[PDB]
Design an enzyme around this catalytic site. Structure first.
Site, short mmCIF file in Angstrom:
data_model
loop_
_atom_site.label_atom_id
_atom_site.label_comp_id
_atom_site.label_asym_id
_atom_site.label_seq_id
_atom_site.Cartn_x
_atom_site.Cartn_y
_atom_site.Cartn_z
N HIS A 1 0.81 -1.22 0.00
CA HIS A 1 0.00 0.00 0.00
C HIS A 1 0.85 1.28 0.00
CE1 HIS A 1 0.45 1.07 4.29
NE2 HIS A 1 0.13 -0.17 4.63
N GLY B 1 3.14 6.38 9.59
CA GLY B 1 4.47 6.26 9.02
C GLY B 1 5.25 5.06 9.51
N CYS C 1 4.34 1.91 9.05
CA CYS C 1 4.15 0.72 8.23
C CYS C 1 5.47 0.27 7.63
CB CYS C 1 3.13 0.99 7.12
SG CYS C 1 1.49 1.37 7.80
#
Lengths: 306, 306
Positions: free
Chosen positions: B41, B143, B145
């Protein structure tokens, strides 16, 4: 979201950890530039520890009696000296992995990360706080002496703790990196009892702010209080008295949540008097006191280092 | 002595962390040999996340649309592909800091360390467990991820988790390093509810053994039980049923303490039925379930790595 007891990344300190052997005693040292720091009781036998005369025991040691190993490589010891309760071993090679660093002597209530090591090799990393009786509640087995505690600010490692002793009650004592013990403790195997382990009030309040930011709000109540009225309850539960300096330090968390510091004190007051009633806050069934205000701000904002 | 929630030393993983930017989205990647792994993503906008067609969104991306930065240095992307829910970005430079490593898919109840990162830079490290509803209880801000979870065995890093999602209830979901989500979760901003968070019984028992080794013994009682009788109580308190496989895994802790596994089950039974009565075990006011038996053995014996 979420709130975890979180240590600093340990890589910068892992690169400083060495093994120090003297006679038959092996513990950990910290290699920064061309100096290795370690507990002076590396020179003691098990019997020596009951009543050691460190100055006399050190007369029988020369540079070549200190075996210092970084991984599988021997460092050459070219000088040694005692500074308070640490030995400073001068080696002929600067550690190429030396980070930017400072030595700091911390105040009770301040937190730090511990890199537990055995035989110069890191085991694990966890968070601790300097208690108001100048012990820490660590996890230290035989051979962990010389493991260090530290904080990191972006690129600079502030070393604040070197591990030396386990008290008969299972709590831990040690020095700053100038070799001065925190509190009254000494590097002798003797009767050393710790004083009252008072709860670090300003840290509990910081953690309650962290809980509110994360959506744990059940404990917020309808009351406010004053410093003097809260402190009458703090003394009864062996909490540290709250000062205006503490109120000021909580200012930014107060501004972010819109909950006045004294309003949060009144919620804490109710939690002390009524308990938690089998409920939890941020997954905890007790009031956590080893997050500082700066710890909370960090974890809730995402401050990084490297 | 002492028992702490202890993470693995993070240095080996810190050296693998990079920043990945695509369009206006920035998260973390893992750089091992000449491949960077990251959540797919990274290619999505905020609007894309409500109903993403990853195959179609990826048609509009080329190698040069992926900006990969290690510290202050740009890596050159020479190939990319989607594997389940991760992107594999081939770069023209092998990471010189690549450790020995494996990709592992862990089972519920298994623990691991998380290195929380933002913008490719480590923030902190903490311990987690894969829950039986296939969430973890992490600390992840915007942030984070692409932050990873891992275990270390001496010199080998076993990567088991990559962070992808926060559920509306504040718990966390992610993939193994082959890109397959743990549990039923998907990388879409949709209604995803977690199932029952059952307590990891074998871990609670391991932690009670750790408590006994450390001198916390008040909870030991006069009773024993059987697997089937204990499990009737486990179901009522949403504990995982104990199996003979679990009994066998607790064997070494049983042998060290001389407390039979079923005797410790009967003490746990009393703790579930009567509560802790305002007492603590290893400093905890609840029954801790994110230490595995192997975790306990490690911390009580001093296993090291590097």
């Amino acid at each position: 979201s979420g709130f975890r007891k979180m240590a600093f990344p340990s890589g910068k300190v892992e690169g400083c950890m060495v093994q120090v052997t003297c006679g038959t005693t092996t513990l950990n040292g910290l290699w920064l530039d061309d100096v290795v720091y370690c507990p002076r009781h590396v020179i003691c036998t098990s019997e020596d520890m009951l009543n050691p005369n460190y100055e006399d025991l050190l007369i029988r040691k020369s540079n070549h009696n200190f075996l210092v190993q970084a991984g599988n490589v021997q460092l050459r010891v070219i000088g040694h000296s005692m500074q308070n309760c640490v030995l400073k071993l001068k080696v002929d090679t600067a550690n190429p992995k030396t980070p930017k660093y400072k030595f700091v002597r911390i105040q009770p209530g301040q937190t730090f990360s511990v890199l537990a090591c055995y035989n110069g090799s890191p085991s694990g990393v966890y968070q601790c706080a300097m208690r108001h009786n100048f012990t820490i509640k660590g996890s230290f087995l035989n051979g962990s002496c010389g493991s260090v505690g530290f904080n990191i600010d972006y690129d600079c490692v502030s070393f604040c703790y070197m591990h030396h002793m386990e008290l008969p009650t299972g709590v831990h004592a040690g020095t700053d990196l100038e070799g001065n013990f925190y509190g009254p403790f000494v590097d002798r195997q003797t009767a050393q009892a710790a004083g009252t382990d008072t709860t670090i009030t300003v840290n509990v309040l910081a953690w309650l702010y962290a809980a509110v930011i994360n959506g744990d709000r059940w404990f917020l109540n309808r009351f406010t209080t004053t410093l003097n009225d809260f402190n009458l309850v703090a003394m009864k539960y062996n909490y540290e008295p709250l000062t205006q300096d503490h109120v000021d330090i909580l200012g930014p968390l107060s501004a972010q949540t819109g909950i006045a510091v004294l309003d949060m004190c009144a919620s804490l007051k109710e939690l002390l008097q009524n308990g938690m009633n089998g409920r939890t806050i941020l997954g905890s069934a007790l009031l956590e006191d080893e997050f500082t205000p700066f710890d909370v701000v960090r974890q809730c904002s995402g401050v990084t280092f490297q």
